[PDB]
Coordinates of all heavy atoms in Angstrom, one line a residue:
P1 N 0.8 -1.2 0.0 CA 0.0 0.0 0.0 C 0.9 1.2 0.0 O 2.0 1.2 0.4 CB -0.8 -0.1 1.3 CG 0.0 -1.0 2.2 CD 0.7 -2.0 1.2
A2 N 0.3 2.4 -0.4 CA 1.0 3.6 -0.7 C 1.9 4.1 0.4 O 3.0 4.5 0.3 CB 0.1 4.7 -1.2
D3 N 1.3 4.1 1.7 CA 2.1 4.6 2.8 C 3.3 3.7 3.1 O 4.4 4.2 3.2 CB 1.1 4.6 4.0 CG 0.4 3.3 4.3 OD1 -0.3 2.9 3.3 OD2 0.5 2.8 5.4
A4 N 3.1 2.4 3.1 CA 4.2 1.5 3.4 C 5.2 1.5 2.2 O 6.4 1.4 2.4 CB 3.7 0.1 3.6
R5 N 4.7 1.7 1.0 CA 5.6 1.8 -0.2 C 6.6 2.9 0.0 O 7.8 2.7 0.0 CB 4.9 1.9 -1.5 CG 5.8 1.9 -2.7 CD 5.0 2.1 -4.0 NE 4.6 3.5 -4.1 CZ 3.3 3.9 -4.1 NH1 2.3 3.0 -4.0 NH2 3.0 5.2 -4.2
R6 N 6.1 4.1 0.2 CA 7.0 5.3 0.4 C 7.9 5.1 1.6 O 9.1 5.5 1.6 CB 6.2 6.6 0.6 CG 5.5 7.0 -0.7 CD 4.8 8.4 -0.6 NE 3.6 8.3 0.2 CZ 2.4 8.0 -0.3 NH1 2.3 7.8 -1.6 NH2 1.3 8.0 0.4
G7 N 7.4 4.5 2.7 CA 8.2 4.2 3.9 C 9.3 3.3 3.6 O 10.5 3.5 4.0
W8 N 9.1 2.2 2.8 CA 10.1 1.3 2.5 C 11.1 1.9 1.5 O 12.3 1.7 1.6 CB 9.6 0.0 2.0 CG 9.1 -0.9 3.1 CD1 7.9 -1.1 3.6 CD2 10.0 -1.8 3.8 NE1 7.9 -2.0 4.6 CE2 9.1 -2.5 4.8 CE3 11.3 -2.2 3.8 CZ2 9.6 -3.4 5.7 CZ3 11.8 -3.1 4.7 CH2 10.9 -3.7 5.7
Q9 N 10.6 2.7 0.6 CA 11.5 3.4 -0.4 C 12.4 4.3 0.4 O 13.6 4.3 0.1 CB 10.7 4.2 -1.4 CG 9.9 3.4 -2.4 CD 9.1 4.2 -3.3 OE1 8.5 5.2 -2.9 NE2 9.0 3.8 -4.6
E10 N 11.9 5.0 1.4 CA 12.8 5.8 2.3 C 13.8 4.9 3.0 O 15.0 5.2 3.0 CB 12.0 6.5 3.3 CG 12.8 7.4 4.2 CD 13.6 8.5 3.6 OE1 13.2 8.9 2.5 OE2 14.6 8.9 4.1
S11 N 13.4 3.7 3.5 CA 14.3 2.9 4.2 C 15.4 2.4 3.3 O 16.6 2.3 3.7 CB 13.5 1.7 4.8 OG 13.4 0.6 3.9
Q12 N 15.1 2.1 2.1 CA 16.1 1.6 1.1 C 17.1 2.6 0.8 O 18.3 2.4 0.7 CB 15.5 1.0 -0.1 CG 16.5 0.3 -1.1 CD 17.1 -1.0 -0.5 OE1 16.7 -1.4 0.6 NE2 18.0 -1.6 -1.3
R13 N 16.6 3.9 0.6 CA 17.6 5.0 0.3 C 18.5 5.1 1.5 O 19.7 5.3 1.3 CB 16.8 6.3 0.1 CG 16.3 6.5 -1.3 CD 15.7 7.9 -1.5 NE 14.5 8.2 -0.7 CZ 13.2 7.9 -1.0 NH1 13.0 7.4 -2.2 NH2 12.3 8.2 -0.2
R14 N 18.0 5.0 2.7 CA 18.8 5.1 3.9 C 19.8 3.9 4.1 O 20.9 4.0 4.5 CB 18.0 5.2 5.2 CG 17.1 6.5 5.2 CD 17.9 7.8 5.3 NE 17.1 9.0 5.4 CZ 17.6 10.2 5.6 NH1 18.9 10.4 5.7 NH2 16.7 11.2 5.8
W15 N 19.3 2.7 3.7 CA 20.1 1.5 3.8 C 21.3 1.6 2.9 O 22.4 1.3 3.3 CB 19.3 0.3 3.5 CG 20.0 -1.0 3.7 CD1 20.3 -1.6 4.9 CD2 20.6 -1.8 2.7 NE1 21.0 -2.8 4.7 CE2 21.2 -2.9 3.3 CE3 20.6 -1.8 1.3 CZ2 21.8 -4.0 2.7 CZ3 21.3 -2.8 0.6 CH2 21.9 -3.9 1.3
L16 N 21.1 2.0 1.7 CA 22.2 2.1 0.7 C 23.2 3.2 1.1 O 24.4 2.9 1.0 CB 21.6 2.5 -0.7 CG 20.8 1.4 -1.3 CD1 20.0 1.9 -2.6 CD2 21.8 0.3 -1.7
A17 N 22.8 4.3 1.7 CA 23.7 5.3 2.2 C 24.5 4.8 3.3 O 25.7 5.0 3.4 CB 23.0 6.6 2.6
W18 N 23.9 4.0 4.2 CA 24.6 3.4 5.3 C 25.7 2.4 4.8 O 26.8 2.5 5.2 CB 23.7 2.8 6.3 CG 24.4 1.8 7.3 CD1 25.6 2.1 8.0 CD2 24.1 0.5 7.6 NE1 26.0 1.0 8.7 CE2 25.0 0.0 8.5 CE3 23.0 -0.4 7.2 CZ2 25.0 -1.3 9.0 CZ3 23.0 -1.7 7.7 CH2 24.0 -2.1 8.6
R19 N 25.2 1.5 3.9 CA 26.2 0.5 3.4 C 27.4 1.2 2.7 O 28.5 0.7 2.9 CB 25.4 -0.4 2.4 CG 24.3 -1.3 3.0 CD 24.7 -1.9 4.3 NE 25.8 -2.8 4.1 CZ 26.5 -3.3 5.1 NH1 26.3 -2.9 6.3 NH2 27.6 -4.1 4.9
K20 N 27.2 2.3 2.0 CA 28.3 2.9 1.3 C 29.3 3.4 2.3 O 30.5 3.2 2.1 CB 27.8 4.1 0.5
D21 N 28.9 4.0 3.5 CA 29.9 4.5 4.4 C 30.4 3.4 5.4 O 31.5 3.4 5.8 CB 29.4 5.7 5.2 CG 29.6 7.0 4.5 OD1 30.4 7.0 3.5 OD2 29.0 8.0 4.9
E22 N 29.5 2.4 5.6 CA 30.0 1.3 6.5 C 31.2 0.5 5.8 O 32.0 0.0 6.5 CB 28.8 0.3 6.7 CG 29.1 -0.8 7.6 CD 29.1 -0.4 9.1 OE1 28.7 0.8 9.4 OE2 29.5 -1.2 9.9
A23 N 31.2 0.4 4.5 CA 32.4 -0.2 3.8 C 33.6 0.5 4.2 O 34.7 -0.1 4.3 CB 32.1 -0.2 2.3
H24 N 33.6 1.9 4.3 CA 34.8 2.6 4.7 C 35.2 2.2 6.2 O 36.4 2.2 6.5 CB 34.6 4.1 4.7 CG 34.1 4.6 3.3 ND1 34.6 4.0 2.1 CD2 33.3 5.6 3.0 CE1 34.1 4.7 1.1 NE2 33.3 5.6 1.6
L25 N 34.2 2.0 7.0 CA 34.5 1.7 8.4 C 35.0 0.3 8.5 O 36.0 0.0 9.2 CB 33.2 1.7 9.3 CG 33.3 1.2 10.7 CD1 34.4 1.9 11.5 CD2 31.9 1.4 11.4
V26 N 34.5 -0.7 7.7 CA 35.0 -2.0 7.7 C 36.5 -2.0 7.2 O 37.4 -2.7 7.8 CB 34.2 -2.9 6.7 CG1 34.9 -4.2 6.5 CG2 32.8 -3.1 7.4
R27 N 36.8 -1.2 6.2 CA 38.2 -1.2 5.8 C 39.1 -0.5 6.8 O 40.2 -1.1 7.1 CB 38.3 -0.4 4.4 CG 39.8 -0.3 4.0 CD 39.9 0.5 2.7 NE 39.1 1.7 2.7 CZ 38.0 1.8 2.0 NH1 37.6 0.8 1.2 NH2 37.3 2.9 2.1
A28 N 38.7 0.5 7.4 CA 39.5 1.2 8.4 C 39.8 0.2 9.6 O 40.9 0.2 10.1 CB 38.8 2.5 9.0
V29 N 38.8 -0.6 10.0 CA 39.1 -1.5 11.1 C 40.0 -2.6 10.6 O 41.0 -2.9 11.3 CB 37.8 -2.1 11.6 CG1 38.1 -3.3 12.5 CG2 37.0 -1.0 12.4
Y30 N 39.8 -3.3 9.5 CA 40.5 -4.5 9.2 C 41.9 -4.2 8.5 O 42.7 -5.1 8.5 CB 39.7 -5.4 8.3 CG 38.6 -6.1 9.1 CD1 37.3 -5.7 9.2 CD2 39.0 -7.3 9.8 CE1 36.4 -6.4 9.9 CE2 38.1 -8.0 10.5 CZ 36.8 -7.5 10.6 OH 35.8 -8.2 11.3
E31 N 42.1 -3.0 8.0 CA 43.4 -2.7 7.5 C 44.5 -2.6 8.7 O 45.7 -2.5 8.4 CB 43.4 -1.4 6.7 CG 43.3 -0.1 7.5 CD 43.4 1.1 6.6 OE1 43.7 1.0 5.4 OE2 43.2 2.2 7.2
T32 N 44.0 -2.5 9.9 CA 45.0 -2.6 11.0 C 45.3 -4.0 11.5 O 46.0 -4.1 12.5 CB 44.4 -1.7 12.2 OG1 43.4 -2.4 12.9 CG2 43.9 -0.4 11.7
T33 N 44.7 -5.0 10.8 CA 44.8 -6.4 11.2 C 45.7 -7.1 10.2 O 46.0 -6.6 9.1 CB 43.5 -7.1 11.2 OG1 43.0 -7.3 9.8 CG2 42.5 -6.3 11.9
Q34 N 46.1 -8.4 10.6 CA 46.8 -9.3 9.7 C 46.4 -10.7 9.9 O 46.2 -11.1 11.1 CB 48.4 -9.2 9.9 CG 49.0 -7.9 9.6 CD 50.5 -8.0 9.8 OE1 51.2 -8.8 9.1 NE2 51.1 -7.2 10.7
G35 N 46.3 -11.5 8.9 CA 46.1 -12.9 9.0 C 44.7 -13.3 8.4 O 43.8 -12.5 8.3
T36 N 44.7 -14.6 8.0 CA 43.5 -15.0 7.3 C 42.3 -15.1 8.2 O 41.1 -15.1 7.7 CB 43.7 -16.3 6.6 OG1 44.1 -17.3 7.5 CG2 44.8 -16.1 5.5
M37 N 42.5 -15.2 9.6 CA 41.3 -15.3 10.5 C 40.5 -13.9 10.3 O 39.3 -13.9 10.2 CB 41.7 -15.5 11.9 CG 40.4 -15.7 12.9 SD 40.9 -15.3 14.7 CE 40.6 -13.3 14.6
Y38 N 41.3 -12.8 10.3 CA 40.6 -11.5 10.1 C 40.1 -11.3 8.7 O 39.1 -10.7 8.5 CB 41.6 -10.4 10.5 CG 41.9 -10.3 12.0 CD1 43.1 -10.4 12.5 CD2 40.8 -10.1 12.8 CE1 43.4 -10.3 13.9 CE2 41.0 -10.0 14.2 CZ 42.3 -10.1 14.7 OH 42.5 -10.0 16.1
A39 N 40.8 -11.9 7.7 CA 40.3 -11.7 6.3 C 38.9 -12.4 6.2 O 38.1 -12.0 5.4 CB 41.3 -12.3 5.3
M40 N 38.8 -13.5 6.9 CA 37.5 -14.3 6.8 C 36.4 -13.6 7.6 O 35.3 -13.5 7.1 CB 37.7 -15.7 7.4 CG 38.7 -16.6 6.7 SD 38.0 -18.2 5.8 CE 39.6 -19.2 5.5
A41 N 36.8 -13.0 8.7 CA 35.8 -12.3 9.5 C 35.3 -11.1 8.7 O 34.1 -10.7 8.7 CB 36.4 -11.8 10.8
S42 N 36.2 -10.4 8.0 CA 35.9 -9.2 7.2 C 34.9 -9.6 6.1 O 33.9 -8.9 5.8 CB 37.1 -8.6 6.6 OG 36.9 -7.5 5.8

């Protein structure tokens, strides 16, 4: 329905923006690590 549609459309726009910057956070954390245990966790 229209209300939920616009609501979910908003959620997806917000999800995508979060995912874009979270990738930078993932890299900043794991570039300070070494070893395949951390590569797998990443």
Side-chain angles (χ1 to χ4, degrees), residues 1-19 21-42:
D3 51 306
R5 182 185 73 246
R6 291 187 284 273
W8 279 96
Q9 289 177 323
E10 178 63 24
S11 85
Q12 185 69 2
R13 274 187 300 270
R14 298 295 187 174
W15 186 76
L16 289 169
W18 165 48
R19 297 312 301 162
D21 276 344
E22 185 77 10
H24 304 326
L25 172 57
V26 168
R27 179 181 41 255
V29 165
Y30 283 98
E31 71 174 357
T32 75
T33 72
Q34 296 181 60
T36 59
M37 190 204 81
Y38 288 122
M40 298 245 197
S42 179

